[PDB]
Each structure stands twice: as structure tokens, then as C-alpha cells.
From a paper:
Desensitization of these ‘non-NMDA’ receptors involves rearrangement of a dimer formed by neighbouring ligand-binding domains (LBDs). The LBD is a clam-shell structure comprising an ‘upper’ (D1) and ‘lower’ (D2) lobe, with ligands bound between the two lobes, and the LBD dimer is formed by contacts across D1 lobes. Specifically, in KARs, additional contacts are formed at the dimer apex (grey surface), including a chloride ion bound on the twofold symmetry axis and two sodium ions bound on either side.
Numbering used by the authors:
A (entry chain B): 431 to 544, 555, 566, 667 to 801, 803 to 804
B (entry chain A): 431 to 544, 555, 566, 667 to 799, 804
């Protein structure tokens, strides 16, 4: 039986292939996560169908009913067998689904314009002129929402007080927001690493605010958690994941 | 019921506490992994007995008979509930035991003296005057043993042909070897970082050769795997793992 694989458009992990003729099914997709999915498919010997998360979200829990959305929700309701995307491994998520060994390490950080006085999250926290934000219902926003670290708690007070105006629908909207206003975008380090390559005016501010990994998501108790985990450790050890990142992290500047 | 926790002596993760008054049981130990163990115990609400792995090994598989040793063996045989140690998460171990989410990330690198022209693994591989080696029956040795990569295959040929002379029983023995002879030691970058803080004549050569994490080990299928994973992710996210590292790490 073919596995249902939920994912989400996000350069350069997952993106539509550009071509003159219409592409169909799995052929439509390409990127780091796609190559990874291919590798896993070969190593473990399964067939699959790629489906984009219906609500177009990563995954967050509503604090009124306690229900999840996005890919996480899709996994909880067994609507998909795997989630192969830049899906962050967090404690709130690991509580409701199972992750594989991480295939990539990263960390929350800041995207801003070059040559400013701003140098750390602390600098943004103790001022209100420069607005800052994050992707809504993402792991970053949740990090700030759950944080008890003074600075980050402050920053979350700001963000929540300004939800409609500072929380964006996607990394792309956040980036453009940085490019079109006095705005600092809290986002994941790897994606910043890719983004600054196509914008000479953009840069990462400070260091990593935390340390996490991307993992393949599976429903809780799934037998694919360990299989896929092993496969990922193998790929990492023989240097294939590194090669894949080399391949997909290039895009003038 | 109390859990049995296997571990291994290794500064600064686990060491015997210095004291004038004789210490007993868990009181005997301190280090990064002991603090970690304490946090897991607080969060998950278990008690425990720390026991050093009897054979003093991390865990590798015997080529001939296929038997495992060390902490990995202790977990396989259900002689321990957890392994809390600087135990590298690897593909081959993951096939026989389970690991929590990593509490620390690292990679294999090179410990050597300062001031030489040696700048990489490749530099070591293409010569023989400077001997080099690794801990026997550990993740690094196994990495070299399994690698299809030319340079690393060549280094494995070198190490294996001189196994008796260049492989060591412990990190400390490899460090002493670096300190007392023309020898380069292949070891994990976190511990290198700890060492080059106490020996100002030593340094890491080159970057990371691979990437891996240390995880808490459990037997395959253990229900504790997930609970510990969640606790580790919690600790990471609140900044505690970082504080522990700052605490325990010229
Ligand atoms: N990769 C994130 C989404 C983007 C972000 O949170 O910055 C997640 O898994 O939720
Ligand atoms: N930390 C290693 C032992 C030391 C080494 O191999 O460098 C292990 O888990 O086996
Ligand atoms: Na889980
Ligand atoms: Na396993």
C-alpha cells in the first residue's frame, strides 16, 4: 500500500518544478525534502503520494479546545502516514506525534537589514519602534508564546499585542515585510541562510536563539518512526544529507 | 520501582565527586549527565540507581560472532532501563536499541598539538610518521570501520593494521598519548572542546568530519524513550541544556 505523504510548499525544501508542460502527481514537486523522500522511499521500499497540507499550516494547538491543525493535525487523524517537510521537532508536538531522528539541525534567529545598530533579540525587546514578528501557528511563534525567558516573554507580549500586524502567513510574507518596512523577522536559521543569498540587503542578527532539528513526522506509535530514523542516520553518516544541502542551498549575491 | 541507569566515567559528563567524606551510591557521581539525569528524574517522577557499565565500554558489535558489548549490550539484555552518558546516536545502534531526542550535537574531529602543518584528516591519511587512532569499540572507530569514503577507508586501513599500537581503551588514554608522543587522536568535538580548555598546547585540527548527537539510550520498544525525548526537548527549549553545558565546560 502506498503511503500518504503530507508536506508544504517552502523553498528550498519543497517547491513546484518549473516546466513548459503541465506536471502531474509526485512529478510536480522538487527540493531537499523531495530528494529525502525519494531516498527514504528507496531504502525502505515503499511507494507514496505527495499531498500538500490542506490548511497550509505547519501545526499548532488551539488553547481553547486543544485541537491541532496543519500537518501535525493530519498526522494525528491518520490522514497521512508521513510528514516530510521542514517540520520542527518541538516538545509540544512530540507530545502528540512521533518524530524521526532529525535530518537537519537549526535554530530560531533574526532576519533584518544590514548595517543597523540592532545586534540581538535583546535590542529588539527593549524598543517598540522596530516591529518584529514570526510565522503564525509555526514553531517559532509557539517558542515565544511558551517561553519564560524574560526577553522572549517580553517579545511575545509585544507580538501578541500586535498579532494582526506582526504575525505573517508564511516565511515569504515575513521576508517581504522585512524588505518593505522597519521589520525584524524571527525565523529559522537554515531558511535565513538560503534567503540572504538572494537579497544583498538582508542578514541574520545575533546568533541562534535556540537549538532544534527538522524531523519526519509520523502518527504516535507508528513503526515508520524508527525505520525512517535509521534510514536518516544512515544517509547522514554516508554524507548524502550534506550533499543534498549543498545542492539545494544555492540561489545572485 | 527505581530504574537502573547505566553510564560510564567520562569527564565532564560523569566523574567521581571529589570529597573528604566517603560517598555512597548516586552521591558518588557528578557531571553534565548526572545533572541531566536529575532533571529527567524530576520531570518524569522516577527514582534510580546509577551503575557504571561493568565492561567499561560504550558499545560495538563483534565482527565474528555478532555479539554486542558495553552499555548497548546492557540495554539489549534489559540489564538497564536507561543509558545516560555521552552515547552517540548511530544508524547501527539505532537498529538494536532506542534513543531519545539528542541532548547535545557534535561531530568527529581531530585532537592534536598546536603549531604543526597538519590541517585536516586528509593530511593525516597521506602520511605515516604521525600515528593516529581512536577509542576501541566506540562510535568513532565504528565510523571509520564502516566508511566508504576514500580518505576514511585509508585511515581505517592504517588504524586497523596497527590496532594494538594506536587504538585506546578510553579518551583519557588517547589524550595522554597526544601529550606524550607524535600522535593524533580522532574523537568527538564536544570532548575536544573540554580538553583544549585544560591543555593549552593542544587544539582541534580541521572541522567536523560528521554530525551526530548524544541521546539517552533505552531498550528497543521501551515506553520511556518517548517520555525522555519530551523531557529533553523541554530542557533544550527552556535553555537548561545550554546552562548545564556552560556549567561543565586557557
Ligand atoms: N518550520 C516551522 C515553521 C516556520 C517557523 O516556525 O519559523 C515549523 O515547523 O513550524
Ligand atoms: N561517545 C562515543 C565514544 C567515544 C568515541 O567513539 O569517540 C560512543 O558513544 O561510543
Ligand atoms: Na510522540
Ligand atoms: Na531502535
Amino acid at each position: 500500500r502506498s503511503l500518504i505523504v503530507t508536506t508544504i510548499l517552502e523553498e528550498p525544501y519543497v517547491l513546484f518544478k518549473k516546466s513548459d508542460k503541465p506536471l502531474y502527481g509526485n512529478d510536480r514537486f522538487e527540493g531537499y525534502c523531495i530528494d529525502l523522500l525519494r531516498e527514504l522511499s528507496t531504502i525502505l521500499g515503499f511507494t507514496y503520494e505527495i499531498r500538500l497540507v490542506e490548511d497550509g499550516k505547519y501545526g499548532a494547538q488551539d488553547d481553547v479546545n486543544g485541537q491541532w491543525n496543519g500537518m501535525v493535525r493530519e498526522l494525528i487523524d491518520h490522514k497521512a502516514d508521513l510528514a516530510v517537510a521542514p517540520l520542527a521537532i518541538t516538545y509540544v508536538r512530540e507530545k502528540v506525534i512521533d518524530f524521526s531522528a532529525p535530518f537537519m539541525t537549526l535554530g530560531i534567529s533574526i532576519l533584518y537589514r544590514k548595517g543597523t545598530p540592532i545586534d540581538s533579540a535583546d535590542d529588539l525587546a527593549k524598543q517598540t519602534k522596530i516591529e518584529y514578528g514570526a510565522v503564525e501557528d509555526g514553531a517559532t511563534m509557539t517558542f515565544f508564546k511558551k517561553s519564560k525567558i524574560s526577553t522572549y516573554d517580553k517579545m511575545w507580549a509585544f507580538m501578541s499585542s500586535r498579532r494582526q500586524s506582526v504575525l505573517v502567513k508564511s516565511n515569504e510574507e515575513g521576508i517581504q515585510r522585512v524588505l518593505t518596512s522597519d521589520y525584524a523577522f524571527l525565523m529559522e536559521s537554515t531558511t535565513i541562510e538560503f534567503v540572504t543569498q538572494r537579497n544583498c540587503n538582508l542578514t541574520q542578527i545575533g546568533g541562534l536563539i535556540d537549538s532544534k532539528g527538522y524531523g519526519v513526522g509520523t502518527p504516535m506509535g507508528s513503526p515508520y518512526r524508527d525505520k525512517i530514523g535509521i534510514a536518516i542516520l544512515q544517509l547522514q553518516e554516508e554524507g548524502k544529507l550534506h550533499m543534498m544541502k549543498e545542492k539545494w542551498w544555492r540561489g545572485g549575491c
